[PDB]
Design a binder for this molecule. Sequence first.
Ligand SMILES: *[C@@H]1O[C@H](CO)[C@@H](O)[C@H](O)[C@H]1NC(C)=O
Lengths: 165, 111, 131
Amino acid sequence: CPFGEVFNATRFASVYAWNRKRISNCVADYSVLYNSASFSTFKCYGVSPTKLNDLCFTNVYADSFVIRGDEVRQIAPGQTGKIADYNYKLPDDFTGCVIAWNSNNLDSKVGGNYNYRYRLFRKSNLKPFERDISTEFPLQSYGFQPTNGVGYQPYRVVVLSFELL
Amino acid sequence: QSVLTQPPSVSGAPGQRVTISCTGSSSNIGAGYDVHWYQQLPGTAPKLLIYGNSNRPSGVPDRFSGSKSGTSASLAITGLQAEDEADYYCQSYDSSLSGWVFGGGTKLTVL
Amino acid sequence: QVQLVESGGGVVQPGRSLRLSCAASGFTFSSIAMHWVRQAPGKGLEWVAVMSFDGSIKYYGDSVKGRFTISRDNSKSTLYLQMNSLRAEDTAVYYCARGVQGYYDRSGYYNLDYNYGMDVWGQGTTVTVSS
Ligand SMILES: *[C@@H]1O[C@H](CO)[C@@H](O)[C@H](O)[C@H]1NC(C)=O
């Protein structure tokens, strides 16, 4: 039921303003997301999959955005950079499942469209799970030519996050 | 001695762009694990400078950049100051020995 | 406030033993892995020993395979490297290095993270061994 959409959505918002989606009182599948070979990183930090069927989780979150290729190594706990410092920072005692898959034919046009944005300049670096949609010029585009490096190519990374009552 | 073979001593004039190359094997870099980069000032303990082949922690400037394509990685200092005379070590992870391997360390100094 | 404190190094008769320590304060010690690395004076760095998140998964380097043993103490948040039968090459300065908090897993099997470096480094201890 709940997240057949967020892994197959047609337009992910950028990392400077990501779009968290909470899901409540639905059935929790938690099996179509794993045992799929299309995912590059399947790092899960607190609790493990194949033991993720204790439906006590209420308001399961799902943050989704798009980062360039070798900046998905900033969505671990700790891991200071310019993505876990100014745009989107995970807490240190994080119990979730950061999932990242490649985007060959979806986000990289032959012209290399500049629709995506990531924030570069910000005083007072973020607390865990802090959005800042402000613009006063701190943002910059990427450029996504399809003959870039494998490390400079967009990875539509989505983070699941759990809590209890 | 080491596993990763980087040049032992490279240097350049100030205000230039010096690249410290670090090539490796088909079992650690060509496997897919990511080459990190360290900075060892003479007499100190090394600190992390670049991880994940291109990222940079808060504290290092935007001068030190990285790259990785195939079985070769390389740091790239741009517009070097006099306060960069340290030693630089490329670290990867080997899959054959199941251990983190280092580089020989390249002596960089200003000219 | 994050810093690693080290103590345990000095002069050692070759064959009788020594046990190294590494304190840690300013973060969570019982969540992050820890690495031990060393440097013979003048030459390059080398990897020695790792201990996992809890103490279940251990790996070792080729030259300390057998004469070196790592063990951590999460009660007082302290890491210990136990060494015996020192040699003429092991005269070196020893760093304990904070690993990564990654204890990632897909399809159940908890395993250490093999793509991250060693973030924060202490000043370390030196050992001197000679007959
Ligand atoms: C989402 O995409 C994957 C890609 O193979 C597919 O297996 C899955 O069925 C899709 N989800 C739907 C159609 O609800």
